[PDB]
Amino acid sequence: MIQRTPKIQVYSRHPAENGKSNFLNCYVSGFHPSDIEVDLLKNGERIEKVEHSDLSFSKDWSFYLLYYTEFTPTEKDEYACRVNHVTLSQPKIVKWDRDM
Amino acid sequence: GSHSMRYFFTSVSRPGRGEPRFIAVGYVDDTQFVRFDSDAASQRMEPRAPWIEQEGPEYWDGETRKVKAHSQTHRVDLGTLRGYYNQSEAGSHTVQRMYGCDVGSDWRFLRGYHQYAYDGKDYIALKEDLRSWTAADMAAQTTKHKWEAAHVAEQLRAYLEGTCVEWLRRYLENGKETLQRTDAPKTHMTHHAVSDHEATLRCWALSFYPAEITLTWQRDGEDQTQDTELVETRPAGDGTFQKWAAVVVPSGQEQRYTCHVQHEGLPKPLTLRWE
Amino acid sequence: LACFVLAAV
């Protein structure tokens, strides 16, 4: 049984401008097995209107998925991606950093 | 340039919870165009690209039949593989299958693939000569013998060298506008203090298609692995891709470093320096 | 277009 820990990247589809609508993405890759919990958070609360890609995998058989939601960034609002997987002691929360 | 068509199938057993999950996706290069999900409403093969929508019901009915069979086969497989390894019906297990063809710039056949994985590792794969099998272990050896007796390799060769290629050509034509496009990366750099003697330089490549790309850091014009970070190429969600490469540097030495960018949308490689 | 070669393991 191969166990792979998910790599997590939180980021916007287009460069972020406060007040201009965009997409917030959470890309989880390199994990195994496929069961995985992915949530997008706004100010700590989960976002309902989220879509996701069809499960696929890389040359090494590890899985990847894209979760994405429409949003309008602001100066104050904090976004994050919450991810849970058997390889994790506790859920991992990765904050969005626009200035990365 | 060169092109490829690939189909990916994932089957996951759900012990005590009913039938296995079955997901299938088809890609041309880095663009997905079809999907099947056992958990969704239609129970049909669905289009995921504009240029496949034009296909008639004959196409959709047939591909729906086909993928459902793939599903049935994997369902039997999961039972078989559990026996091969004498596993309990407590654990969930995974079957993965990937096949497809590559064509060169002349759109002529180049390479064929048919690979099978159990629980995230190689199980059995068709070799490049499309006449022989690589088996991961003695359980896979049983399967190998089955597929040699049933001459599966020869059946696959026909598909990979014929049907697979011929249809890839057809998608490339009908989806010319998107599939034959080349979006060159938009590049820029960022700088962050890490201590008061170190700083991170991050090289950004955005809005590019296809996804194949190379980001290298040079220092005084010489390649530099060492303190360098390369993230997995990621989808923007609009058909384009993103990637960055970073390096940690002594403050005051930022100008020693250059990020180099290679992509087929770029006539000549880009060289970036801080500011 | 997918393959119709489906041999069981």
Return the HEC string of chain B: CCEEEEEEEEEECCCCCCCCEEEEEEEECCEEEEEEECCCCCCCCEECCHHHHCCCHHHHHHHHHHHHHHHHHHHHHHHHHHHHCCCCCCCCCEEEEEEEEEECCCCCEEEEEEEEEECCEEEEEECCCCCCEEECCHHHHHHHHHHHHCCHHHHHHHHHHHHHHHHHHHHHHHCHHHHCCCECCEEEEEEEECCCCEEEEEEEEEEEECCCCEEEEEECCEECCCCEEECCCEECCCCCEEEEEEEEEECCCHHHEEEEEECCCCCCCEEECCC
Question: Quick one: CA dihedral A46, A50, A54, A59, positive or negative?
Answer: negative
Residue B198 marked as a ligand binder: yes
* Assigned fold of B182-270: Immunoglobulin-like (2.60.40)
Phi first, then psi: what are they for C2, rounded to 5°?
-80, 175
| Angstrom distance (rounded) from CA B259 to CA B188 | 10
Domain total in chain A: 1
| Angstrom distance (rounded) from CA B124 to CA B2 | 27
**Contact: B150, C7; criterion CB under 8 Å:** yes
* Nearest-by-Cβ selection for B235 from A32, A34, A66: A66
Question: How many C-beta atoms lie closer than 10 Å to residue B191's C-beta?
Answer: 12
Which subunits have 3 or more CB–CB pairs within 8 Å of chain B? A, C
| Angstrom distance (rounded) from CA B221 to CA B165 | 42
Residue B242 Cα, gap to closest chain C Cα (Å): 29
**Contact: A34, B190; criterion CB under 8 Å:** no
Indicate the length of chain B as a whole number: 275
Q: This structure's resolution (angstroms)?
A: 2.6
Q: CA B16, B22, B24 angle in degrees (round to 5)?
A: 170
Q: Does B237 touch chain A (CB under 8 A)?
A: yes
Cα C4–chain centre separation: 4
* Nearest-by-Cβ selection for C7 from B59, B63, B147: B147
Examine chains A and B and say if they touch (3+ CB pairs below 8 A): yes
- Residue B267: asked if its preceding bond is cis (omega within 30°), the reply is no
Is B268 within 8 Å of B187 (Cβ atoms)?
Answer: no
Residue A28 Cα, gap to closest chain B Cα (Å): 9
**Contact: B96, A33; criterion CB under 8 Å:** no
- The position carrying tokens 């609002």 is A77
Delimiting residues of CATH 2.60.40.10 domain(s) in chain B: 182-270
Pick the residue from chain C with its C-alpha nearest to B163: C1
Chain B hits for A28, Cβ within 8 Å = none
* Nearest-by-Cβ selection for C3 from B84, B99, B124: B99
Instruction: Residue A73: give the domain boundaries.
Output: 1-100
**Contact: B146, C9; criterion CB under 8 Å:** yes
Q: Which amino acid is at B190?
A: T
**Contact: C5, B7; criterion CB under 8 Å:** no
Question: How many C-beta atoms lie closer than 10 Å to residue B52's C-beta?
Answer: 20
Is B118 within 8 Å of B95 (Cβ atoms)?
Answer: yes
Calculate the alpha carbon distances from A48 to A27, A39, A76, B235 in Å: 17, 9, 20, 21
Question: Quick one: CA dihedral B260, B266, B268, B273, positive or negative?
Answer: negative
Q: Which amino acid is at C3?
A: C
Domain with residue A23: its CATH number is: 2.60.40.10
Q: Which amino acid is at B47?
A: P
Q: Which two tokens stand for residue A89?
A: 């002691």
Q: Which two tokens stand for residue B62?
A: 């047939």
Residue B57 Cα, gap to closest chain C Cα (Å): 14
Which subunits have 3 or more CB–CB pairs within 8 Å of chain C? B
Q: Does B234 touch chain A (CB under 8 A)?
A: yes
Residue B124 Cα, gap to closest chain A Cα (Å): 13
CATH code of the region B1-181: 3.30.500.10
Question: How many C-beta atoms lie closer than 10 Å to residue B178's C-beta?
Answer: 16
- Can you give A6-23 as a three-state secondary structure string? CEEEEEECCCCCCCCCEE
| Angstrom distance (rounded) from CA B84 to CA B140 | 9
| Angstrom distance (rounded) from CA B197 to CA B192 | 11
Which B residues in the span 143-182 are in contact with C, Cβ-Cβ below 8 Å? 143, 146-147, 150, 152, 155-156, 159, 163-164, 167
| Angstrom distance (rounded) from CA A19 to CA A15 | 12
Which B residues in the span 142-171 are in contact with A, Cβ-Cβ below 8 Å? none
Chain B hits for A56, Cβ within 8 Å = 8, 10, 25, 27, 32
Q: Which residues of B208-240 are buried (b: 16+ CB within 10 A; e: fewer)?
A: bbbbebebbbebeeeeeeeebeebebbbbbeeb
Delimiting residues of CATH 3.30.500.10 domain(s) in chain B: 1-181
Chain B hits for C6, Cβ within 8 Å = 69-70, 73
